[PDB]
Write an enzyme that holds these catalytic residues in place. Structure first.
Site, mmCIF file in Angstrom:
data_model
loop_
_atom_site.group_PDB
_atom_site.id
_atom_site.type_symbol
_atom_site.label_atom_id
_atom_site.label_comp_id
_atom_site.label_asym_id
_atom_site.label_seq_id
_atom_site.Cartn_x
_atom_site.Cartn_y
_atom_site.Cartn_z
ATOM 1 N N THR A 13 0.669 -1.329 0.000
ATOM 2 C CA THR A 13 0.000 0.000 0.000
ATOM 3 C C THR A 13 0.676 1.343 0.000
ATOM 4 O OG1 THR A 13 -1.511 -0.896 1.445
ATOM 5 C CG2 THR A 13 -1.642 1.312 1.621
ATOM 6 N N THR A 14 -0.090 2.334 -0.432
ATOM 7 C CA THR A 14 0.267 3.737 -0.268
ATOM 8 C C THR A 14 -0.974 4.514 0.173
ATOM 9 O OG1 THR A 14 1.780 3.527 -2.155
ATOM 10 C CG2 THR A 14 1.377 5.747 -1.294
ATOM 11 N N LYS A 54 -9.483 1.109 1.628
ATOM 12 C CA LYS A 54 -8.491 1.350 2.672
ATOM 13 C C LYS A 54 -8.804 2.601 3.463
ATOM 14 C CE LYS A 54 -4.853 -1.012 0.266
ATOM 15 N NZ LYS A 54 -3.549 -0.893 -0.418
ATOM 16 N N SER A 109 4.111 0.962 1.927
ATOM 17 C CA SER A 109 5.325 0.641 1.173
ATOM 18 C C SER A 109 5.719 1.706 0.147
ATOM 19 C CB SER A 109 5.170 -0.711 0.468
ATOM 20 O OG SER A 109 3.898 -0.824 -0.152
#
Ligand SMILES: *[C@@](C)(CO)[C@](*)(O)[C@H](Cc1ccccc1)NC(=O)[C@H](Cc1ccc(OC)cc1)NC(=O)[C@@H](C)NC(=O)C1=CC2=CCC=CC2=C1C
Ligand SMILES: [Mg+2]
Lengths: 222, 233, 231, 240, 195, 211, 235, 244
Positions: free
Chosen positions: F1-2, F33, F130
């Protein structure tokens, strides 16, 4: 040292239609390179028009399903025989899984049925309890083999309209129950060819407003 | 967490038209030492069920006592203990499966592999497996340990699927089981010649056979085998 | 008198007054009738309201697919005891894959109620129960008293004016036992039985409560316009 | 453990132990609370039966629960310490978990809850204490004054009194206190609080304690001479 | 976190603490205040394992504030430091110890003296004219040993502190994003907004 | 993810990707998310999906109970603290959670970073997961307080795109949110595949990529 | 003395019966259920004019779709309300849905008989729990310290209860509007109250499917009181 | 069951009094009189032993005056056994404080702690209260010299001069008459003994029927000294003040 976990193989597949839903799974049960059973049911009717399958470690899978079936029973007792909606069942299952956050149920769970507007619904879970509603989901041993095929043939990914050359996408037309079952059977036939833990038999549970119907198909036994 | 000490090897079983058959040898191994030669690993529960157990013998004896106590407890305040409210194979199996899974969930397993064979009230055949992990499964043929690798292939040639069960007689099924026990004696280093066999039939009831021996063994061809390649004498 | 202050005290004649006072709460409660044949078992209950604006207190509780009861007395105590039965029925299914025998269910209720009659601090249950069910030995009807006494019967009734319905069933014994494979006729006999305990008031659509269980019939409760057929 | 049910209902629907706890409050020294336009004043009686007392070290009647909230009481003195300690612990616990100081209403609700809990818990008797809780909420200029009692009920008051002869001083406050126009300044608010106590106190010497609480954690206790000046001015106007 | 410094001069205690907070390979914040006011004349800076630091500091703060209200009296810096030490010494033998190192800078209003206490996570207390935790002392103590006098002014203390930070910025491989400086004296606690 | 979130003149922007991985296998193409705790409160998710969903949904229970008891909306500061205290109970037990609690309250717009260690940080701009390093690069160079709502939404969208491109464990689609004093506003799901080609042409960026 | 969980010779729990007497001394609370909503109204009953009446909170929100009014020893209700709010929000956590009014009421009533020698005595307060759900629509329940709960079309509890209940007997019908119910609560409250009814010593509230549970402003209630006076003077 | 035999020690009377606390105070009123007088340069503690015998070993005896730490002492009135339970608890509390903060415990904090323990026995537990009243004499650097009293109710108050035990009404009147704020220790010693000599139920006040103690800054420079008087020293101060 004692290892409390094991791997019973198997593969499951849930697809949500416009006014229906299917939950399919192979009937083979295995340890290592041996076959335990060629027919060991893995997808269950849990009542209230909900079907469920806990794929992975069979002992944890049977325990979870057993506990959810129990949760449905007590939901009727506690709330005046109210029907447990698919979204409510999904949230309940999250809390069942996370109750073992530090000693997880080693299963990938999928449930299927109809939402409160009568539309097809599939929910998918991870071992520790993350869940979300989906249109298409393959789980288990051959999940990585099947999902890309479903992205292509259900959601028409990377498919465009001839003549335009990449400018216009293929439109997302809805699929019938007969069309979905074809994609399910071909998915498992292909998975059976290239995955050693997949085979023997295929059992599909179809959910509509009329109820839960079953269909069985033979798979290769090698 | 433990390790198994005194152990019992394969338990094999299969369904036939009117019932089920189960068998297991009479050996209690202590590692590579063939220590105890008079161990009964088939334990009847009533006149409709036989529980076959492999793995740790001390845990087997514990399970044996649980079942003996289960029969006692079922008879309490039960006028139909020898009739409608008698213990069924499905009741006995689910009890054991509950115990096995609870014990593994406490990281203190009963180090066993169990097959519950029997016939239900309605005449239906019952055959289900459970082990130290609480893993359960059912099949027309079931076998533990080495039996899974060597016996099942032979037994599945008789009953390959569900539809072959009504076509299989008790004589054919017993013959297949007895042949499988011979093959295991040839090839399992932790097995013995002496074994026990049990038949649970919906008509003739429970037949329990003790002190059986593997017979009609082929060894004569050994005389001709010489060396490991080039040796002639 | 001097021996009714708590449940732990026998009277000079060997009586337990707190248990007898708990028994009195059942007699104040509304009437409920139980009866069975060889195929089916039926509960019939007269529900009671607080006033015209109020609803009619529910009398029948489901315990499992094959078992349930009707109450008379303190309703909360019935909720506690029925919850216990639900758990016991459920323990039998999950552990032994076995439907709980109605006779064994009665033995469990007896033992739970008994503990409350011998210990200091607690109190006896203030409710009477009629348990019906269908198991491997056919149809069954039980009567539970909070003294601990549980009794298997062909038919019975508990609550206010229950003696009238109990006499009727005692006459009709030979008839209603033979009503096999006919649920509607067995209910009719139960509705006719509970009618012998009525005074002033009569059976209306939101007054009557019926439940049935049998061979190929799960425990189901009938209320509202579903019982208008039997009025 | 000792589990005996001490607070129980009687045939007429009364909990006598809670009602007898109110009698202990009736015996306690008088406490008064008056809120002005931009302040609250807490007045307290000190019985002059006890002389040779060391007023430096003797427990003061008004207690700070936090920097912005105060608590006075009437009834059993020892019982009040337990409530005050619990209230002080909760005030710090609230700052620690929510990153804001307690509101006056919240602190009152907590103290009242503790009192209530002691009316239906086994092996304990009710607190023989009624409290007046006053202060200003964080970043707010509206005065707050609450009252609690042994039963556990609480409510907000424009002005209130508790303790012995509280019936008399409440009578005074009801006719003297105007809601449409409350004491506009600190002087007027203190003057009205002293006047109300002078109906009951006896001598206006060391028998009256006054504590002024202003917004933004501005709390001060008046001295003997400062109070004595109010006592002097009141009686000189009365001689007419 | 990393660098926390402390120096006790004539009439005050000066605490300098880094502003950086790192998570993975990314600096999430460059303005973090690694300190809590325990009382009007007592300041505690802290450094150690992530999460534990603030939880411990706020727990200490709550206890000292509770004491202040109960007694209507401010505990001496010595008394506070002993309370903090005991909590850490209690902690080190717990199931999961709190990995926090602290400096306590306070002005004792009774004795009219500044006081600096250095306490590590084991509960090791020492009163010092200047102190640090972790590797900070390896670079700075030689400068402090040389330049420090007990009769220094607050301004001279700040100049010597700047020299320590400059040496850290030169010889440390670590970018700690400068420091927040706070002064503790008779008038209370204030922050130097330009440093 | 970001994930990212930042404060600005007109409130706070919240942008996240939608990828979920189980090793190198992409288990999910579109996972939500963000969690909507209340009309004025949002929560981002990075780390273990189960841990993020369970604890933040449990936070919403506790934030809801706050409203009922006090008749008033919980602050962003208080909400973030409740969550960090939950993380501190399961200290060292193996939870993996990184979230930003975004909202509007009496003090104005609020933004707090909270993780499994118990760390709780107030700030104008945060990014987790990440691919946070790629997002920070675009944010730091283009961020201003004086941003318009339109430009701000694009910045958060473009910043996720940057990460989705380079980071293998970030991608799928972009979910946008805008928090105002009248509550949060959802600004849609944006497929990265389509968004990439669009941005490339319109912006002139990603010159090295052929299309 | 005697046990707390003791039965009387008539078959009733002494303590439960005595707690009912405490509820009779409480201030009046009235509830009326209609097809357009459920109205809840209470008598505040301030003991003194210096007591700020707006701080008297005898009507309370449990959830957005469930409200509650109380009568008797009102301090005892706080733990019941806390449990109800927790139960309502916890069910929303477990099942992603609103909780049924009956199920909420049952959860509150489960606390009732948890007393002995658990808490030391029964609750000395009765509750009118009003709400709405999709299954059974608009509902009004009366929760007692006995553990029993009855559903009601209309109900009054407190000191003027039997007089108010007789009035509700005549006035209630199945076609009542929300506005009609509001005026009816005000009418009956004004009848049984000692002091003269106004916006400061009486409070109204309602629960509708659209807007949820709402406590009425003093300005809004004042207009409904003025509307009541005029319609009574109209004949 | 057991309920039948429960006296219910922690309940209110209809008048709002605590039965057991009031009856405990009645017990204490028959105990030997103890007096405390606070001066500008020290504190005096004087107490009367109850009808002694000639065969009682006085020099090793202690029934009235106890040492809590170097700075704080107490005079006892009531059940001695009950007092020793509380005294040992107070000694531990003072050491706990010293270990935690590395400073001697302030007098009031110690007093509040003991008074809170007494309070607990009146509100919960179902046990009888401690039949003890204390006079605390102590010093700290905040408030200097301090006198407190606590009783079975757990209520405590500060005093310039105070008496507990028997004849407190008469004793308090005599103290209120002759006490002045600028008084010194040597004068306070005389006042304490004169008050006991007039209030005593005995025929004459002698050395063997007394326990005596002072807390003085009369120690070499800025520090405090506790002096528990010996039998011979009590005999000397009785002659000095002109009582025997
Ligand atoms: C980046 C993808 C990191 O690679 C994000 O951090 C993402 C955050 C996130 C995703 C979904 C929902 C909320 C937040 N993180 C992950 O996806 C996360 C990475 C990860 C994995 C494992 C641990 O330690 C336990 C920590 C962090 N991945 C997952 O949680 C994986 C395990 N999820 C699945 O594998 C998964 C399979 C699946 C099937 C059906 C429905 C959901 C499913 C999930 C979430
Ligand atoms: Mg294959």
């Amino acid at each position: 040292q004692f290892n409390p976990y094991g791997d019973n193989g198997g593969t499951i597949l849930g697809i949500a239609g416009e006014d229906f839903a299917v939950l399919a799974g192979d009937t083979r049960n295995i340890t290592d390179y041996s076959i335990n059973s060629r027919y060991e049911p893995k997808v269950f009717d849990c009542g209230d028009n909900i079907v469920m399958s806990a794929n992975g470690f069979a002992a944890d899978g049977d325990a979870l399903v057993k506990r959810f079936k129990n949760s449905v029973k007590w939901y009727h007792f506690d709330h005046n025989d109210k029907k447990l909606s698919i979204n409510s069942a999904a949230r309940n299952i999250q809390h069942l899984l996370y109750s073992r956050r530090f000693f997880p149920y080693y299963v990938y769970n999928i449930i299927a049925g109809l939402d409160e507007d009568g539309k097809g619904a599939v929910y998918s879970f991870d071992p520790v309890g993350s869940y979300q509603r989906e249109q298409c989901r393959a789980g288990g041993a051959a999940a990585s083999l099947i999902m890309p095929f479903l992205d292509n043939q259900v959601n028409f990914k990377n498919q465009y309209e001839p003549g335009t050359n990449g400018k216009v996408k293929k439109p997302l037309k809805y699929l019938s129950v007969e069309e979905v079952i074809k994609l399910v059977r071909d998915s498992f036939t292909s998975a059976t060819e290239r995955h050693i833990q997949v085979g023997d038999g295929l059992e599909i549970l179809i959910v509509t407003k009329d109820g839960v119907r079953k269909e069985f198909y033979e798979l290769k036994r090698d | 967490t433990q390790q198994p000490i005194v152990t019992g090897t394969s338990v094999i079983s299969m369904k036939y038209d009117n019932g089920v058959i189960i068998a297991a040898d009479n050996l209690g191994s202590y590692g590579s030492l063939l220590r105890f030669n008079g161990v009964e690993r088939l334990i009847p529960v009533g006149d409709n069920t036989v529980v076959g157990i492999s793995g740790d013998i001390s845990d087997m004896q514990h399970i044996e006592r649980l079942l003996k106590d289960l029969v006692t407890e079922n008879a309490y305040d039960n006028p139909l203990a020898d009739a409608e409210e008698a213990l069924e194979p499905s009741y006995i199996f689910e009890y054991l499966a509950t115990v096995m899974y609870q014990r593994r969930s406490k990281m203190n397993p009963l180090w066993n592999a169990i097959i519950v064979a029997g016939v239900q009230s309605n005449g239906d055949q019952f055959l289900r497996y459970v082990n130290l992990l609480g893993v359960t499964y059912s099949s027309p043929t079931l076998a533990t340990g080495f039996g899974a690798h060597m016996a099942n292939p032979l037994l599945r040639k008789v009953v390959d699927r569900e539809s072959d069960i009504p076509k299989t007689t008790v004589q054919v099924a017993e013959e297949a089981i007895v042949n499988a026990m011979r093959v295991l004696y040839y090839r399992d280093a932790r097995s013995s010649r002496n074994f026990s066999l049990a038949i649970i039939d919906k008509n003739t009831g429970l037949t329990f056979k003790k002190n059986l021996q593997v017979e009609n063994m082929k060894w004569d061809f050994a005389k001709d085998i010489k060396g490991y390649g080039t040796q002639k004498i | 008198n001097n021996y009714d202050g708590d449940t732990v005290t026998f009277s000079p004649t060997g009586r337990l007054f707190q248990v007898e006072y708990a028994l009195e709460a059942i007699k104040q409660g509304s009437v409920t009738v139980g009866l069975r044949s060889n195929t089916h078992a039926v509960l019939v209950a007269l529900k009671r309201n607080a006033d015209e604006l109020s609803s009619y207190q529910k009398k029948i509780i489901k315990c499992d697919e094959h078992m349930g009861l009707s109450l008379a007395g303190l309703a909360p105590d019935a909720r506690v005891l029925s919850n216990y039965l639900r758990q016991q029925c459920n323990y039998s299914s999950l552990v032994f894959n076995r439907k709980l025998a109605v006779e064994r269910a009665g033995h469990l209720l007896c033992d739970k109620a008994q503990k409350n009659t011998q210990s200091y601090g607690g109190r006896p249950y203030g409710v009477g129960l009629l348990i019906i069910g269908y198991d491997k030995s056919g149809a069954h009807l039980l009567e539970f008293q909070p003294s601990g006494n549980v009794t298997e019967l062909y038919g019975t009734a508990i609550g206010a004016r229950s003696q009238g319905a109990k006499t009727y069933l005692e006459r009709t014994l030979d008839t209603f036992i033979k009503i096999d494979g006919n649920p509607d006729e067995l209910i009719k006999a139960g509705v006719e039985a509970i009618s012998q305990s009525l005074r002033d008031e009569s059976l209306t659509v939101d007054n009557l409560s019926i439940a049935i269980v049998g061979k190929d019939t799960p425990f189901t409760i009938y209320d509202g316009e579903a019982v208008a057929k039997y009025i | 453990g000792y589990d005996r049910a001490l607070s129980i209902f009687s045939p007429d629907g009364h909990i006598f132990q809670v009602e007898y706890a109110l009698e202990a409050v009736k015996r306690g020294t008088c406490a008064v609370g008056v809120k002005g336009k931009n302040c609250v004043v807490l007045g307290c009686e000190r019985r002059s039966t006890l002389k040779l007392q060391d007023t430096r070290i003797t427990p003061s009647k008004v207690s700070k629960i936090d920097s912005h909230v105060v608590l006075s009481f009437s009834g059993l003195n020892a019982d009040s310490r337990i409530l005050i300690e619990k209230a002080r612990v909760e005030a710090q616990s609230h700052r620690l978990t929510l990153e804001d100081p307690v509101t006056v209403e919240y602190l009152t609700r907590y103290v009242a809850g503790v009192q209530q809990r002691y009316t239906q818990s086994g092996g304990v008797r009710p607190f023989g204490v009624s409290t007046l809780i006053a202060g200003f909420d964080p970043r707010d200029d509206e005065p707050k004054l609450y009252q609690t009692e042994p039963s556990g009920i609480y409510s907000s008051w424009s002005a209130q009194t508790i303790g012995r002869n509280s019936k008399t001083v409440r009578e005074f406050l009801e006719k003297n206190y105007d809601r449409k126009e409350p004491p506009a300044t600190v002087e007027e608010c203190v003057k009205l609080t002293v006047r109300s106590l002078l109906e009951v106190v006896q001598t206006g010497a060391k028998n009256i304690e006054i504590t002024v609480v202003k917004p933004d954690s501005d709390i001060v206790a008046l001295s003997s001479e400062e109070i004595n000046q109010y006592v002097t001015q009141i009686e000189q106007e009365k001689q007419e | 976190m990393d660098i926390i410094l402390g120096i006790r001069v004539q009439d005050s205690v000066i605490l300098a603490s880094s502003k950086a907070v790192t998570r993975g390979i990314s600096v999430l914040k460059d303005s973090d205040d690694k300190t809590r006011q325990l009382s009007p004349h007592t300041l505690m800076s802290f450094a150690g394992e992530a999460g534990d630091t603030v939880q411990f500091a706020e727990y200490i703060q709550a206890n000292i504030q509770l004491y202040s209200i109960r007694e209507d009296y401010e505990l001496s810096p010595q008394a506070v430091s002993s309370f903090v030490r005991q909590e850490l010494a209690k902690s080190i033998r717990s199931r999961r110890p709190y990995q926090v190192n602290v400096l306590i800078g306070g002005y004792d209003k009774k004795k009219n003296k500044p006081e600096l206490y250095q306490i590590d996570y084991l509960g090791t207390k020492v009163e010092l004219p200047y102190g640090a935790h972790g590797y900070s002392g390896f670079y700075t103590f030689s400068l402090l040993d040389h330049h420090y006098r007990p009769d220094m002014t607050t301004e001279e203390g700040l100049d010597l502190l700047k020299l320590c930070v400059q040496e850290l910025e030169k010889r440390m491989p670590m970018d700690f994003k400068g420091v927040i400086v706070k002064i503790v004296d008779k008038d209370g606690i204030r922050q130097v907004d330009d440093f | 993810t970001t994930t990212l979130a930042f404060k600005f003149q007109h409130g706070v922007i919240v942008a996240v990707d939608s990828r979920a991985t189980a090793g190198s296998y992409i288990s999910s193409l579109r996972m939500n998310k963000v969690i909507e705790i209340n009309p004025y409160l949002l929560g981002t998710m990075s780390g273990c999906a189960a841990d993020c969903q369970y604890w933040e949904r449990l936070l919403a229970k506790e934030c809801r109970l706050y409203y009922l008891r006090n008749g008033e909306r919980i602050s962003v500061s208080a909400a973030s603290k409740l969550l960090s205290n939950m993380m501190l109970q399961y200290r060292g037990m193996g939870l993996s959670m990184g979230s930003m609690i975004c909202g509007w309250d009496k003090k104005g717009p609020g933004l707090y970073y909270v993780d499994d260690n118990g760390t709780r940080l107030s700030g104008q701009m945060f990014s987790t997961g990440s691919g946070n390093t790629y997002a920070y690069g675009v944010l730091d160079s283009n961020y201003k307080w004086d941003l318009s709502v339109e430009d701000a939404l694009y910045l958060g969208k473009r910043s996720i795109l940057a990460a989705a491109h380079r980071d293998a464990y970030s991608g799928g689609s972009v979910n946008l949110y805008h928090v105002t004093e009248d509550g949060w506003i959802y600004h849609g799901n944006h497929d990265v595949g389509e968004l990439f080609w669009k941005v490339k042409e319109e912006e002139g960026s990603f010159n090295n990529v052929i299309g | 003395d005697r046990g707390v969980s003791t039965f009387s010779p008539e078959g009733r729990l002494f303590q439960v019966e005595y707690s009912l007497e405490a509820i009779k001394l409480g201030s009046t609370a009235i509830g009326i259920a209609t097809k357009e909503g459920v109205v809840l109204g209470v008598e505040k009953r301030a003991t003194s004019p210096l007591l700020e009446s707006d701080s008297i909170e005898k009507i309370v929100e449990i959830d957005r779709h469930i409200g509650c009014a109380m009568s008797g020893l009102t301090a005892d209700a706080r733990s019941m309300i806390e449990h109800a709010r927790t139960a309502a929000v916890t069910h929303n956590l477990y099942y992603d849905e609103d909780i049924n009014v009956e199920s909420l009421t049952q959860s509150v009533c489960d606390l009732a008989l948890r007393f002995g020698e658990l808490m030391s005595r029964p609750f000395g307060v009765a509750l009118l729990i009003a709400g709405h759900d999709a299954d059974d629509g608009y509902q009004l329940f009366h929760a007692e310290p006995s553990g029993t709960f009855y559903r009601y079309n209309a109900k009054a509890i407190g000191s003027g209860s039997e007089g108010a209940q007789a009035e509700l007997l005549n006035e209630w019908h199945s076609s009542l509007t929300l506005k009609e119910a509001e005026l009816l609560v005000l009418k009956i409250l004004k009848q049984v109250m000692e002091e003269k009814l106004d916006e400061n010593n009486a409070q109204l509230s309602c629960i509708t499917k659209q807007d949820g549970f709402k406590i009425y402003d003093n300005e809004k209630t004042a207009e409904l009181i003025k509307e009541l006076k005029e319609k009574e003077a109209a004949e | 069951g057991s309920r039948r035999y429960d006296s219910r020690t922690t309940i209110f009377s209809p008048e709002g009094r605590l039965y057991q606390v009031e009856y405990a105070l009645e017990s204490i009123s028959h105990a030997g009189t103890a007096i405390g007088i606070m001066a500008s340069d020290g504190i005096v503690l004087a107490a009367e032993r109850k009808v002694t015998s000639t065969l009682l070993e006085q020099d090793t005896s202690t029934e009235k005056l106890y040492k809590l730490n170097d700075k704080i002492a107490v005079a006892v009135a009531g059940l001695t056994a009950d007092a020793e339970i509380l005294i040992n608890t107070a000694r531990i509390h003072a050491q706990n404080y010293l270990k935690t903060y590395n400073e001697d415990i302030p007098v009031e904090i110690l007093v509040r702690r003991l008074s809170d323990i007494k309070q607990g026995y009146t509100q919960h537990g179902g046990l009888r209260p401690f039949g003890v009243s204390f006079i605390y004499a102590g010093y700290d650097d905040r408030y200097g010299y301090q006198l407190y009293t606590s009783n079975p109710s757990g209520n405590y108050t500060g005093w310039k001069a105070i008496s507990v035990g028997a004849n407190t009404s008469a004793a308090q009147t005599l103290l209120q008459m002759d006490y002045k704020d600028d008084m010194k220790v040597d004068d306070a010693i005389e006042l304490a003994l004169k008050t006991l000599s007039k209030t005593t139920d005995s025929s004459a006040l002698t050395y063997d029927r007394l326990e005596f103690a002072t807390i003085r800054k009369g120690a070499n420079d800025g520090e405090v000294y506790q002096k528990i008087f010996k039998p011979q020293e009590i005999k000397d101060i009785l002659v000095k003040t002109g009582i025997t």
